[PDB]
Amino acid sequence: TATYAQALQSVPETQVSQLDNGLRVASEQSSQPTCTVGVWIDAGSRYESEKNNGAGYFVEHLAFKGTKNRPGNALEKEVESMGAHLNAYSTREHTAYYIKALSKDLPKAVELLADIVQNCSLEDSQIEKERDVILQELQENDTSMRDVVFNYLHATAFQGTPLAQSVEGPSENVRKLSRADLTEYLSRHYKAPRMVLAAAGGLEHRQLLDLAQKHFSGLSGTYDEDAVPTLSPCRFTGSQICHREDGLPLAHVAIAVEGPGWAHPDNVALQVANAIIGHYDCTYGGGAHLSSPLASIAATNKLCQSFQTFNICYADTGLLGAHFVCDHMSIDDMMFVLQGQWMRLCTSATESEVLRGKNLLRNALVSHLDGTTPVCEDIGRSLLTYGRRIPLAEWESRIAEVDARVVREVCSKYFYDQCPAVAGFGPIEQLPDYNRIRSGMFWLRF
Amino acid sequence: LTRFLGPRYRQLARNWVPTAQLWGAVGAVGLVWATDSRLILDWVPYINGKFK
Amino acid sequence: VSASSRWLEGIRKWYYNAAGFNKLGLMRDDTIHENDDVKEAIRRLPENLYDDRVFRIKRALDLSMRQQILPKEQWTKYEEDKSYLEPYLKEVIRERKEREEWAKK
Amino acid sequence: AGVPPHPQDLEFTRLPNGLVIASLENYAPASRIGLFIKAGSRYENSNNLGTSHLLRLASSLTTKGASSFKITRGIEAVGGKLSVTSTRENMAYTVECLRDDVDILMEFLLNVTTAPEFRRWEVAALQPQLRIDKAVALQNPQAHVIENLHAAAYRNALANSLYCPDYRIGKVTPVELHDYVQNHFTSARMALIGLGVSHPVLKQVAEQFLNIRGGLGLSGAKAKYHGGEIREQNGDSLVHAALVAESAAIGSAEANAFSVLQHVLGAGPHVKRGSNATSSLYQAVAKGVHQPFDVSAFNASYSDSGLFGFYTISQAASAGDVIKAAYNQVKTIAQGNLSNPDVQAAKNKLKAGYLMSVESSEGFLDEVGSQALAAGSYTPPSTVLQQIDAVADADVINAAKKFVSGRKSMAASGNLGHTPFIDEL
Amino acid sequence: MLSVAARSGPFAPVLSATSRGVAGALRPLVQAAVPATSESPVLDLKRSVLCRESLRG
């Protein structure tokens, strides 16, 4: 018959092995003809000072434009010709480079990744070409109201801390960053005990460890000692940023309290409550019959174009709340209906709705880990944030634990009577005054 | 009438019971203090000072 | 089918005539109190039934005002009192009761 | 050892009534079931345009076995999804949940597809969603172009519009949906695909609930290629343009040759922020064009026709130069300027690309379903890679030859002052 | 190789009960945002990209 609990046991164990220099090498072997290999670096914008805030993003732009062993076109041509896809990203805490390739092409994929990671030929003519490209991207990102509001939310919540900074950096830093600025960041940050070589697909683990000694060895000899860089905690501030712009058709609001951070066991319970509230979009079929009270009232009364809950995680901190996009006249109702939902759950959560939230999460977790790219991403990220790969059976075990009593206790710990960080953009005349938002963070009835 | 009889509502009652108990305490001590209700106030140590 | 079940039917025809909405040309379902289930059932009616309903209500309010009644031949006959709202109203209550059963667990 | 369980094989069954059943026990924590129907936009006629769009939006409306409220609440209770994904040929109703909950979602699935009620008031309430749904899709300039491309190419079925025509919004009737289901949602036009389900169970439900007759027969009225051009003055900063000619029907040997030619000229990017060094069209344009541009080989295959050519995004003034550089690049392949390693690279791109496309259960299920409907069989990846390999360099040149010399179809939007008519190419 | 996604070209609309509305398969735009000037159409009475059912543990 094969039950769901039984099926969680069936997924193979992530094999973790450490190299002599500090490079963690981890694999999840499956049956697939393809794979995803990558390097996950514990480096972002939180690691950057005010004077070098665009650095990680600048290196990301240069990482595929030529190495000492493969100049200019060479990397592109090699990856393209074997049918492989080469990708990268940088978040406030993590930088990643990964190849989607055939499993038989795993030797070459690992080799090419090593070249990008260690031997990036940061060519003077190229860093000058890249500055015009990043500047254009900044003008591009301005038009995305969503990207702006979340950047504002980090800026106001994490006021005067490394976390207030965006991944991209400011315009001043993009046009001023030197060749020496980027090599200094690279030497300080791209060090083996802060790197995970992750892989998922039709590969044996022994194959991967061989390749890591074959291509990543040569980051030892002597390392660290003089400059040990550990992250200092980031103070969250209850605050508001309001960018009034009546020329934009719809308002964007992101509201969040301080979350606990990656490691904390009660991230599971917060996520269940975030599932109960869920997310909405004007293209959803459900309408008035949707389970979630906020979603159902929002559809019925045409209260927005969309909303989404989030639990953004950082080391020892994070942002927990909702973002929505709505008409100028609908901001007040939307705040009220959302805040009332946080409070309902904080004081009076019920057994049934909590099981639904548990079920959405089980489904979210399993649907997410589908194919080599999501699993390889989960291997790299988890090794940086948890130290191990948390098996699906354990996630289920930690999900199954969460009753209504858990939800309202954990919700209260973070949501009840707390100062939110509020980010507003667009036609925001009807956006509530901070005091009133603060007032919606408690119930006089309770 | 019959619509409010179910597992969720029993949970919802259990959730608001400590709160509805504490509002009763607010109401009682509130009424006792506002009327100077001697019957109850004869029991409390510092408020006792009203020697006939 | 039965002699006494023909008598319940004749007592029902008696009450129907005593109620006297038929004297104002109304059908039984015209006379229903408008609650939320009812409002929805009216809303769910096809064009032809809604339009007829509107006219019958219009006619009876006009008669009510002038304190008149229709000629005897034009009264709604108990036998032909079409219960047009019945299946609509039954479906709305069916739907409500489900929502309420769901809101219980 | 950290090894997986030995992988099970796909189980395929053609029922005597025409219906296909396919399943794979992958032992996944979640399950996926799709009912794929030969009911796409091409089976609409001029009297009922947009009926399959409203139907696509109607998957959550009252059925005989489950009310609108029940379908929504029951699926969400278990954290499930119900999605309906239309193409020009197909309609796919895909259901998704954890494996303990299949039975509930199957029942919902069967109700939505085999016992919908299309209640007068429920259907009237949903009409405004066609406007919302279209507006959201049509905010990609590509959508309207590829819509205009198909309307220009065909006189017939594939010319149909995928999103409901504006004049039909608020006009598609409950009876039209009833008629659309009665004559397209039949056994011989259907396939039931299962993932994380056992074959005896899928075969059981198909023999119990999916035995439906009395519809239409073949793959509709044979899609008649015509050619022509649709032009949309837009004021949209950049000009989007698609050049296309008739290619090959899906499954044929020639179709595979067109897919290799698509990868020779260049499909999507491979490197995040890349010059696309192996992209034949991109390099050909970039030699002559220095502003922001994009160019890609467009490849569309259907049951009885195909459209191959290219798609361009360029500055309004640069439009003619980009299209002419792109067209001439194809012309050199047609003339015979194509190397063996060139084709090899394209072959690896197509092979690996296909393999990557079926990596997830979302992509695997969609492929098996489309195969079941188009071919009446399942073709394993190893043999698809064999068919890709069978393509000779001459076959690729001939596919280019066929495009260069065939009656063209064009669709363009933006400031078209410098965008050429077919006439001028 | 019989699919709209596997041949990558013609458009494919997707509606659902809980997940956001999706449009289309292949044609260029990903190698058009790299020559960066593509401002991407505003939220003018509009839904949300990237969907939502990919939430980590």
UniProtKB/Swiss-Prot annotation, chain A:
GO cellular component: mitochondrial inner membrane; mitochondrion
Key words of the record: Acetylation, Electron transport, Membrane, Mitochondrion, Mitochondrion inner membrane, Phosphoprotein, Respiratory chain, Transit peptide, Transport
GO molecular function, one term: metal ion binding
Membrane topology: Peripheral membrane protein
Modification type N6-acetyllysine: residues: 77, 104, 129, 214
InterPro entries: Metalloenz_LuxS/M16, MPP/UQCRC_Complex, Pept_M16_N, Peptidase_M16_C
Phosphoserine PTM sites in chain numbering: 178
Signal peptide: none
Modified residues (N6-succinyllysine): 129
Protein location: Mitochondrion inner membrane
Superkingdom, taxonomy of origin: Eukaryota
Ranges annotated as spanning the membrane: none
Quaternary structure note: Component of the ubiquinol-cytochrome c oxidoreductase (cytochrome b-c1 complex, complex III, CIII), a multisubunit enzyme composed of 11 subunits. The complex is composed of 3 respiratory subunits cytochrome b, cytochrome c1 and Rieske protein UQCRFS1, 2 core protein subunits UQCRC1/QCR1 and UQCRC2/QCR2, and 6 low-molecular weight protein subunits UQCRH/QCR6, UQCRB/QCR7, UQCRQ/QCR8, UQCR10/QCR9, UQCR11/QCR10 and subunit 9, the cleavage product of Rieske protein UQCRFS1.
PANTHER family: CYTOCHROME B-C1 COMPLEX SUBUNIT 1, MITOCHONDRIAL (PTHR11851:SF116), METALLOPROTEASE (PTHR11851)
Function of the protein: Component of the ubiquinol-cytochrome c oxidoreductase, a multisubunit transmembrane complex that is part of the mitochondrial electron transport chain which drives oxidative phosphorylation.
Family from the record: Belongs to the peptidase M16 family. UQCRC1/QCR1 subfamily.
Protein name: Cytochrome b-c1 complex subunit 1, mitochondrial
UniProtKB/Swiss-Prot annotation, chain C:
GO annotation (BP), single: mitochondrial electron transport, ubiquinol to cytochrome c
UniProt modified residues of type N6-acetyllysine: 13, 72, 77, 82, 90
Domain of life: Eukaryota
Coiled coil: none
Family matches, as Pfam families: UCR_14kD
Family: Belongs to the UQCRB/QCR7 family.
Summary of the function given for this chain in its UniProt record: Component of the ubiquinol-cytochrome c oxidoreductase, a multisubunit transmembrane complex that is part of the mitochondrial electron transport chain which drives oxidative phosphorylation.
Protein name, entry field: Cytochrome b-c1 complex subunit 7
Species the sequence originates in: Bos taurus
Organismal lineage: Eukaryota, Metazoa, Chordata, Craniata, Vertebrata
UniProtKB/Swiss-Prot annotation, chain D:
Keywords: Acetylation, Electron transport, Membrane, Mitochondrion, Mitochondrion inner membrane, Respiratory chain, Transit peptide, Transport
Gene3D superfamilies: Metalloenzyme, LuxS/M16 peptidase-like
Function: Component of the ubiquinol-cytochrome c oxidoreductase, a multisubunit transmembrane complex that is part of the mitochondrial electron transport chain which drives oxidative phosphorylation.
Protein name, per record: Cytochrome b-c1 complex subunit 2, mitochondrial
Transmembrane segment boundaries: none
Highest taxon of the lineage: Eukaryota
Plastid as UniProt keyword: no
Subcellular location: Mitochondrion inner membrane
GO-annotated biological processes: proteolysis
Protein family according to the UniProt entry: Belongs to the peptidase M16 family. UQCRC2/QCR2 subfamily.
GO cellular component: mitochondrial inner membrane; mitochondrion
Subunit structure: Component of the ubiquinol-cytochrome c oxidoreductase (cytochrome b-c1 complex, complex III, CIII), a multisubunit enzyme composed of 11 subunits. The complex is composed of 3 respiratory subunits cytochrome b, cytochrome c1 and Rieske protein UQCRFS1, 2 core protein subunits UQCRC1/QCR1 and UQCRC2/QCR2, and 6 low-molecular weight protein subunits UQCRH/QCR6, UQCRB/QCR7, UQCRQ/QCR8, UQCR10/QCR9, UQCR11/QCR10 and subunit 9, the cleavage product of Rieske protein UQCRFS1.
Cystine pairs: none
Topological category with respect to the lipid bilayer: Peripheral membrane protein
Principal location listed in the UniProt entry: mitochondrion
Modified residues (N6-acetyllysine): 38, 171, 222
A molecular function (GO) term: metal ion binding
InterPro entries: Metalloenz_LuxS/M16, MPP/UQCRC_Complex, Pept_M16_N, Pept_M16_Zn_BS, Peptidase_M16_C
Curated annotation (Swiss-Prot), chain E:
Domain of life of the organism encoding this protein: Eukaryota
Cited function: Component of the ubiquinol-cytochrome c oxidoreductase (cytochrome b-c1 complex, complex III, CIII). UQCRFS1 undergoes proteolytic processing once it is incorporated in the complex III dimer. One of the fragments, called subunit 9, corresponds to its mitochondrial targeting sequence (MTS). The proteolytic processing is necessary for the correct insertion of UQCRFS1 in the complex III dimer, but the persistence of UQCRFS1-derived fragments may prevent newly imported UQCRFS1 to be processed and assembled into complex III and is detrimental for the complex III structure and function.
Subunit-structure text: Component of the ubiquinol-cytochrome c oxidoreductase (cytochrome b-c1 complex, complex III, CIII). Subunit 9 corresponds to the mitochondrial targeting sequence (MTS) of Rieske protein UQCRFS1. It is retained after processing and incorporated inside complex III, where it remains bound to the complex and localizes between the 2 core subunits UQCRC1/QCR1 and UQCRC2/QCR2.
Protein name per the record: Cytochrome b-c1 complex subunit 9
Taxonomic source organism: Bos taurus (Bovine)
Gene expressing this chain: UQCRFS1
